[PDB]
Amino acid sequence: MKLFYKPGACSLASHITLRESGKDFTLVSVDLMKKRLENGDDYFAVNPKGQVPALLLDDGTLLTEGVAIMQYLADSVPDRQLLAPVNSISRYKTIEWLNYIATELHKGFTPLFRPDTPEEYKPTVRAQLEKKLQYVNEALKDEHWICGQRFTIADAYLFTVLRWAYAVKLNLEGLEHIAAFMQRMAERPEVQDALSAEGLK
Amino acid sequence: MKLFYKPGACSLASHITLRESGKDFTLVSVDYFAVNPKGQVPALLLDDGTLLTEGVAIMQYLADSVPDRQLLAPVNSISRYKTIEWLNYIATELHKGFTPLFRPDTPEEYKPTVRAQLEKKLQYVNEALKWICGQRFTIADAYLFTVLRWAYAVKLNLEGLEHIAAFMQRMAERPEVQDALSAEGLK
């Protein structure tokens, strides 16, 4: 099994989930500027959308979209409780968090990473992101994980995206619950192992 | 259940899904922070008083509640993760793609880029359709339909995208889709 990734990109969420799920895999880095692998091959021939992550299964299935990849992996190991069981309301609350992170935070940050984005527009995006972070910080008030006291694929995703707040230097003053969360997450061995393998830390 | 909706909005996907899943429910117009702190539609008020937000989450909760209808395939099937893949694509690449074309804070100068990125994604959607994921109707079809209505509304260039057009026609012929459109005062 192969994870197509870029160091520190959104694909880190799927990389963490792979480690939390106990699966062996191979990491393949993608140049997103040139849409090329290290071996020179055209990445568009693997994933036509040209984005990371993508997960290629042993049987040749290609899965794209981080949220789908992460549900596929969680559903494979129900004893790990990375996602509560089908039909259980806490499952769908976890799914609610995944979609919020996907649409409101992950895609909220994207315009800061693109060349086609007008410079003059960046201050608007940053201001929007700082308000969202106020909401996330409140949601984390209980200082454990985002859903309850179980670790889930939503935590892996939120952690991955919130790293970007530090990287672009948004104003995080007094967002203490985000701080506690990031600290709890960075202590997990499976997240330390993912960060090391991507060259982060 | 109550559905909190607005007629044209992303909430129509959740409303089709409720009709396709056989649920009884009430509609409630929104122009609300005391109900949903996010101030968005859709939101689905369950019978224990619990609120579920995020269309993608609502749709999966409903489809899973009626597995024999095959609105979403079972866990550990590849077809389930293909439907989930479409849901996320539509949410993050199409839906959020359109959203700038509505807000006031958005500069005119970002606009050509937004529309061109969207024209590009629609070429990809048209080729994928050459229902969206297999021979069965799913929640991904419901959401794609909802969001593509906006492509028509804001006059994106859909020239040559005949599989999209034929999809919009097949969707509008579904009785439960017609009833949902009808109940929201749309044609």
Ligand SMILES: N[C@@H](CCC(=O)N[C@@H](CS(=O)(=O)O)C(=O)NCC(=O)O)C(=O)O
């Ligand atoms: N809808 C996709 C989005 C994936 C994402 O946007 N990929 C970025 C990397 S990241 O900015 O989100 O870290 C992309 O590959 N960039 C290249 C492509 O957009 O050209 C899914 O959620 O996985």
Ligand SMILES: N[C@@H](CCC(=O)N[C@@H](CS(=O)(=O)O)C(=O)NCC(=O)O)C(=O)O
């Ligand atoms: N991440 C949310 C976003 C929901 C969506 O952004 N809702 C819009 C309406 S729509 O453009 O998707 O039809 C919201 O109510 N808008 C709040 C603002 O317009 O006041 C989920 O996907 O449902």
